[PDB]
Design an enzyme around this catalytic site. Structure first.
Site, PDB file in Angstrom:
ATOM      1  N   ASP A  12      -5.904  -3.479  -2.545  1.00 18.57           N
ATOM      2  CA  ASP A  12      -4.814  -3.142  -1.634  1.00 18.57           C
ATOM      3  C   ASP A  12      -4.132  -4.390  -1.093  1.00 18.57           C
ATOM      4  O   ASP A  12      -4.781  -5.389  -0.762  1.00 18.57           O
ATOM      5  CB  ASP A  12      -5.346  -2.283  -0.477  1.00 18.57           C
ATOM      6  CG  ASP A  12      -4.240  -1.534   0.266  1.00 18.57           C
ATOM      7  OD1 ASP A  12      -3.445  -2.196   0.973  1.00 18.57           O
ATOM      8  OD2 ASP A  12      -4.158  -0.288   0.131  1.00 18.57           O
TER       9      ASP A  12
ATOM     10  N   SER B  41       0.876  -1.195   0.000  1.00 17.59           N
ATOM     11  CA  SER B  41       0.000   0.000   0.000  1.00 17.59           C
ATOM     12  C   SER B  41       0.906   1.236   0.000  1.00 17.59           C
ATOM     13  O   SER B  41       1.887   1.268  -0.756  1.00 17.59           O
ATOM     14  CB  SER B  41      -0.983  -0.092   1.143  1.00 17.59           C
ATOM     15  OG  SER B  41      -2.022   0.857   0.997  1.00 17.59           O
TER      16      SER B  41
END
Ligand SMILES: Nc1ncnc2c1ncn2[C@@H]1O[C@@H]2COP(=O)(O)O[C@H]3[C@@H](O)[C@H](n4ccc(=O)[nH]c4=O)O[C@@H]3COP(=O)(O)O[C@H]2[C@H]1O
Ligand SMILES: Nc1ncnc2c1ncn2[C@@H]1O[C@@H]2COP(=O)(O)O[C@H]3[C@@H](O)[C@H](n4ccc(=O)[nH]c4=O)O[C@@H]3COP(=O)(O)O[C@H]2[C@H]1O
Lengths: 312, 312
Positions: free
Chosen positions: A183, A53
């Site tokens: 993500d 991320s």
């Protein structure tokens, strides 16, 4: 200024960077001090960097040879704007803009060290880890392409695409396979274990010859529903997202310790009573986030003697 | 009828049971066939059973020597009622009632095999694994108490307490430490890796001498928001809960395969196009859930030859 040079040994030095919205100012505080302690850009001393991320933003810039001060300037310029977004479409556009502007058309053939950028496959619900070199692949090496032929921008955008609040990121691999990605924090917001998997299994490094440094974003007082209800309409989903990411981060560290006691490892993600922030998804106040830089430098100072022994 | 007896070898047979709301009817379908193939209660053939959330219900009953038919009757009697609840307070009461009625005052000294029941510490955000015997502890064995002195009811209730939709479950250990616990599925809804950690690290078993069977709840078409909005007021948080649990389950299996290629392992959690159900939290229609029993028996039949070789 980063002119210090180091000899070559058979020790695999591994850097693992947590995801955490715009709170990676803490991470950069830690990294700045590690950089200045070494006297060289991080890619010269570290053999492998993993990120997830917003931590994959830092990891990719490190792998392209950036200095921490340069990373801090780019991170300041683009990451808080993503988190300031208050619509899925605004968030996805902000993130797309960050990816292209920061990484342009660099690819995984352009990296100067080992890398792993972690995303999550929407379909199989298993990780997709963009890597730079076949020697850290665990199988199917005849068809290996660095980064699956995907650009660093698209891989980092995928690693950051926290659906349902971002759109899923569609990717087409060099082998012609199309994948929908979200993500990486859903499977390994702390990517240390994944990085260790590369070092032990794929690089055949003995545990004695591995040094792992895992930097998080720090731990701060949790926002309560009263605050969250004022800034987010789906506040319970927003809270669940944060709490689950935290559990994934901390439980991943506990699992590493259980399975790999004999791999020297330093994790740097201290607890602080300020600042009071929103969740990782929502916090963008630079006045609060900039104080995390100091907190990261404080966390390095509490571990400097052992960090010196790890990195020499 | 389960009169078949087996000799003793140095092979550690490990059973790992996923969590998944009331959809463990699938799991029990698989287990029923494994039981009938063996000719003995599962605790006689298996050395170690791990379970998480509603899978810990099954795992604890197996460890207490129940036969699968008995487990199915208890599971039918109590689990769907928990999932039919539509308020946090109703859910927590239903779950408390299940725990006491099913397990009464049994403790972790009452088990007939190795066990691990996985919950999540609210404070440290790391797992708390209730175990039966010190020989599978990885440290601090001088202070080891089976199950931390906690009853099986409280440990299983903790493993199932999926806050924010259940209350967190408060526990006081035999050493006098008070802990707030939530569903184990946040850290290992698939507990196979944790079980392998016990077998490899704590029981010092060589990988050649381990056989792992991991049974899930099966994979079915995902409920879309239109349906979820009609049954749940916090539908997005409800969807996020399900999606994150699925990712934890599948990514945990991928990580096991990466780290432990050389440990023989069978995972049984097939994909089906029916029935169309709500999320694991919400589905309670026995007419739909009972058809999962057949699907579990079908999944065993697709693997019976290799299961025979694992379990003899
Ligand atoms: N260190 C790790 N920690 C935890 N899990 C890991 C780790 N490494 C891999 N996995 C998981 O194992 C699955 C199969 O991995 P394999 O290494 O056996 O084969 C690789 C390789 O041959 C090739 N490839 C990889 C990277 C690249 O940049 N270009 C490229 O071509 O594709 C396959 C990767 O695809 P995914 O990434 O989507 O799936 C992975 C992942 O889910
Ligand atoms: N197989 C595994 N897979 C993944 N993670 C694992 C595994 N095993 C342990 N851990 C994690 O490692 C941490 C420390 O484990 P240790 O084994 O070193 O010490 C144990 C033991 O001495 C004692 N004890 C354990 C069980 C019991 O019924 N009574 C009892 O007294 O308490 C400590 C446990 O406390 P937690 O469970 O809360 O924390 C664990 C867990 O987070």
């Amino acid at each position: 200024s980063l002119l210090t040079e180091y000899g070559n040994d058979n020790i695999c030095r591994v850097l693992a960077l947590d995801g955490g919205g715009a709170k990676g100012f803490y991470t950069l505080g830690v990294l700045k001090e590690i950089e200045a302690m070494l006297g060289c850009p991080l890619y010269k001393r570290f053999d492998l960097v993993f990120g997830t991320s917003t931590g994959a933003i830092i990891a990719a810039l490190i792998a392209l040879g950036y200095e921490v001060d340069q990373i801090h300037a780019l991170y300041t310029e683009h990451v808080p704007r993503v988190m300031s977004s208050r619509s899925a479409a605004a968030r996805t556009m902000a993130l797309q803009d960050l990816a292209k502007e920061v990484f342009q058309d660099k690819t995984f053939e352009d990296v100067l060290m080992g890398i792993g950028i972690v995303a999550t496959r929407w379909m199989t619900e298993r990780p997709m880890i963009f890597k730079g070199n076949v020697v850290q692949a665990h199988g199917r090496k005849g068809t290996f392409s660095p980064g699956f032929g995907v650009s660093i921008a698209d891989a980092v955008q995928a690693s950051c695409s926290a659906y349902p609040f971002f759109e899923r990121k569609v990717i087409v691999t060099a082998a012609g396979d199309k994948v929908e990605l979200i993500d990486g924090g859903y499977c390994a917001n702390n990517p240390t274990l994944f990085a260790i998997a590369d070092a032990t299994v794929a690089l055949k490094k003995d545990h004695k010859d591995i040094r792992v440094i895992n930097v998080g974003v720090g731990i701060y007082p949790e926002p309560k529903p009263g605050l969250l209800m004022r800034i987010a309409k789906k506040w319970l989903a927003v809270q669940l997202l944060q709490k689950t990411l935290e559990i994934n981060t901390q439980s991943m560290d506990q699992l590493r310790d259980i399975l790999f006691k004999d791999i020297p490892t330093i994790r740097i993600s201290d607890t602080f009573e300020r600042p009071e922030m929103a969740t990782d998804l929502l916090e963008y106040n630079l006045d609060k986030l900039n104080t995390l830089r100091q907190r990261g430098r404080e966390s390095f100072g509490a571990r400097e003697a052992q960090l010196r022994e790890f990195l020499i």
